[PDB]
Amino acid sequence: SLKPVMIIQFSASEGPGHFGDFLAGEHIPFQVLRMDRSDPLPAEIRDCSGLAMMGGPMSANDDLPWMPTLLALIRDAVAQRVPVIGHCLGGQLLAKAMGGEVTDSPHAEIGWVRAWPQHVPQALEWLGTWDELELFEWHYQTFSIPPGAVHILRSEHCANQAYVLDDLHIGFQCHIEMQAHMVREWCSISPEELKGGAEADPAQPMVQSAVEILRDLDVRIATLNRWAEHVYARWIKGLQREGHHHHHH
């Protein structure tokens, strides 16, 4: 009888991914709302046990009809201790709601990138390790670290890969939700953004080709899935739960 996790989705192609499968395997109910279909947001954040946000094909700075309402809802989640998890745009929106800014990156990241946890105990707790990680990226902008948050992960071309707030909320620039078929799908929807593509700037130091992105895909997805599951397992410890005051046997 847990209240559902509310998942905010911004397009048809960017679904819950591994996160959805993880919740299904925990028998945690979840409800998706599509911002691109103008689905209404709940007035009361406490109607959900936790708030998750996926990525989307827009900038966090774009002037969209649901933007003020969603930023206010994120603020309410943080005030009410309803945990928030944000993936790519979702990480950016968590940061913006809390006072951070989203700006254009000097260089984009598209494909598999080397990343290093910050040497802080929060990185060990949430990511499982201080060892190098491999991240899946597809982004042109970056969040600042929001006030009160702890920076936990960096890459060469994007220092701000992840942060944690209040031991409860976590935002990522990268996509920890990926499954192999989604990588394939995204590459097929937008091939021109990839190295060699019609829209790609050949000077980009961290934009990979389709061939590079698909190389050893299943094995590197399994690697990602395992530490993503560590993050998700930590994050759900924070779900809001109505305490029973009596039984019903």
Side-chain angles (χ1 to χ4, degrees), residues 32-87:
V32 172
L33 293 178
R34 285 277 298 279
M35 293 306 88
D36 61 308
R37 298 185 76 202
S38 299
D39 290 346
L41 289 160
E44 170 56 288
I45 190 60
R46 301 268 306 284
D47 289 1
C48 78
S49 57
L51 174 68
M53 297 183 281
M54 317 309 307
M58 45 176 281
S59 169
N61 302 317
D62 287 346
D63 186 16
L64 291 151
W66 45 259
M67 183 68 70
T69 301
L70 181 62
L71 297 177
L73 191 66
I74 295 159
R75 290 193 285 269
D76 288 351
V78 175
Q80 292 297 308
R81 298 186 64 75
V82 171
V84 186
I85 183 164
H87 302 79

Side-chain angles (χ1 to χ4, degrees), residues 212-233:
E212 288 165 338
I213 289 169
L214 301 175
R215 180 171 289 150
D216 302 305
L217 184 57
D218 287 338
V219 170
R220 78 204 301 178
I221 287 284
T223 297
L224 173 59
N225 288 341
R226 293 307 87 74
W227 71 268
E229 284 164 359
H230 183 278
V231 174
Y232 293 151

Side-chain angles (χ1 to χ4, degrees), residues 71-234:
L71 297 177
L73 191 66
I74 295 159
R75 290 193 285 269
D76 288 351
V78 175
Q80 292 297 308
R81 298 186 64 75
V82 171
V84 186
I85 183 164
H87 302 79
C88 197
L89 177 61
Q92 294 172 344
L93 293 174
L94 174 58
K96 188 153 192 190
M98 302 307 305
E101 60 180 352
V102 178
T103 56
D104 293 314
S105 299
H107 304 294
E109 298 178 315
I110 307 175
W112 301 105
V113 322
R114 303 181 69 191
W116 298 273
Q118 290 295 119
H119 293 187
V120 296
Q122 296 80 354
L124 177 63
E125 180 172 351
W126 284 85
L127 306 177
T129 188
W130 291 357
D131 294 352
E132 183 179 332
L133 295 173
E134 170 169 279
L135 315 186
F136 190 76
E137 297 289 358
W138 194 323
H139 74 102
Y140 296 93
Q141 304 195 308
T142 178
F143 48 73
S144 64
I145 303 301
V150 175
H151 178 216
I152 64 165
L153 185 65
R154 59 170 272 277
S155 72
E156 177 175 6
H157 296 290
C158 179
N160 290 344
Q161 298 285 345
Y163 58 82
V164 287
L165 181 62
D166 297 332
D167 203 29
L168 218 35
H169 316 293
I170 189 167
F172 286 94
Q173 188 60 76
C174 58
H175 290 272
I176 64 166
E177 79 283 11
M178 302 310 291
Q179 299 187 324
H181 69 285
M182 293 169 66
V183 176
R184 296 187 184 284
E185 281 155 18
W186 293 3
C187 290
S188 289
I189 291 164
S190 198
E192 307 313 334
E193 288 183 66
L194 307 180
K195 187 180 176 167
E199 299 176 14
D201 180 352
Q204 293 266 29
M206 198 52 265
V207 169
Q208 293 191 319
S209 70
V211 164
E212 288 165 338
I213 289 169
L214 301 175
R215 180 171 289 150
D216 302 305
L217 184 57
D218 287 338
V219 170
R220 78 204 301 178
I221 287 284
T223 297
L224 173 59
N225 288 341
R226 293 307 87 74
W227 71 268
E229 284 164 359
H230 183 278
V231 174
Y232 293 151
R234 179 54 184 84

